[PDB]
Write an enzyme that holds these catalytic residues in place. Structure first.
Site, PDB file in Angstrom:
ATOM      1  N   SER A  44       0.763  -1.257   0.000  1.00  0.00           N
ATOM      2  CA  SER A  44       0.000   0.000   0.000  1.00  0.00           C
ATOM      3  C   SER A  44       0.797   1.313   0.000  1.00  0.00           C
ATOM      4  O   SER A  44       0.203   2.393  -0.059  1.00  0.00           O
ATOM      5  CB  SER A  44      -1.016   0.022   1.145  1.00  0.00           C
ATOM      6  OG  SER A  44      -2.072  -0.890   0.911  1.00  0.00           O
ATOM      7  N   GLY A 210       1.959  -0.054   4.646  1.00  0.00           N
ATOM      8  CA  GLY A 210       1.710  -1.139   3.714  1.00  0.00           C
ATOM      9  C   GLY A 210       1.709  -2.473   4.431  1.00  0.00           C
ATOM     10  O   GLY A 210       2.475  -2.689   5.373  1.00  0.00           O
TER      11      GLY A 210
HETATM   12 NA    NA Z   1      -1.041  -2.513   2.641  1.00  0.00          NA
END
Ligand code: NA
Length: 262
Positions: A44, A210
């Protein structure tokens, strides 16, 4: 140097897997580099770059943040807490950027990729601002596969740091967009257990987290300590074998080490 490398190596042994760190104190030019040139899965963390790319289109007068994006349930992928509430009304690009950053909204991220030319378009953007390392190949959710030895959807801690610096402190974006990306990352709700938890109390951070398969956990941030120039910090980890709570602790601890050494 070696003494510090031993410390990051002790963390890798403790948690399993592989840890990457790049930190830069803009006020002294001092850096920390550990596996800073090795590839790691972005997961992410790319969503901050995706928003940037949308902002760059606006700077170029080719796009508007107020533009309303319509989407369907065919667009909804897992972990989309915000977008899963506005199928009927749609959402604006501003609202999608904000959701993708502050809530790591997967559907919102895919939508940003739509308006940007997809993973290839985002990568193209990154090349345009001097990042010749970072690459996005796939969409949510496949991009989180995090396969060992797989170059797809990867960055290096040093490349991401340089890129984040250009976007938030440099001149890659207009002043307005830079300020807007800055506000979004500062307003992140997902990063409390990570970099933020490792730094001294009074330090302002804008960050993007992330999470991915193969025990991947990352966090990239700009940090504004009181009365000082900012610090850029990119921390990536993959392959570890630990529960959610302690992957969080790995990242916070690396951040803590960085603040002591930098
Ligand atoms: Na992520």
């Amino acid at each position: 140097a070696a003494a510090l490398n031993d410390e990051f190596a002790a963390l890798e042994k403790q948690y399993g897997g592989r840890l990457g760190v790049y930190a830069l104190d803009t006020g002294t030019g001092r850096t920390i580099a550990y596996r800073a040139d090795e590839r790691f899965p972005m997961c992410s963390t790319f969503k901050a770059l995706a928003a940037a790319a949308v902002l760059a289109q606006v700077d170029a007068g080719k796009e508007s943040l107020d533009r309303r994006i319509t989407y369907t349930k065919d667009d909804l992928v897992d972990y989309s807490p915000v977008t899963e509430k506005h199928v009927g009304t749609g959402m604006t690009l501003a609202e999608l950027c904000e959701a993708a950053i502050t809530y790591s909204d997967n559907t919102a991220a895919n939508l940003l990729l739509d308006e940007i030319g997809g993973p290839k378009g985002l990568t193209a953007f990154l090349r345009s601002i001097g990042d010749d390392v970072t690459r996005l190949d796939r969409w949510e959710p496949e991009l989180n596969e995090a396969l060992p030895g797989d170059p797809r959807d990867t960055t290096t801690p040093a490349a991401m740091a340089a890129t984040l610096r250009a976007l938030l402190l440099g001149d890659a974006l207009s002043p307005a967009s830079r300020a807007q990306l800055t506000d979004w990352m500062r307003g992140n709700t997902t990063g409390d257990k990570l970099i933020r938890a490792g730094l001294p109390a009074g330090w302002r951070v804008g960050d993007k987290t992330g999470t991915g398969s193969y025990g991947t956990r990352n966090d990239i941030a700009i940090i504004w300590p009181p009365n000082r120039a900012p610090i850029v910090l990119a921390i990536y980890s993959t392959g570890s074998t630990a529960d959610a709570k302690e992957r969080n602790a790995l990242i916070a601890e690396a951040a803590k080490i960085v603040a002591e050494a930098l």
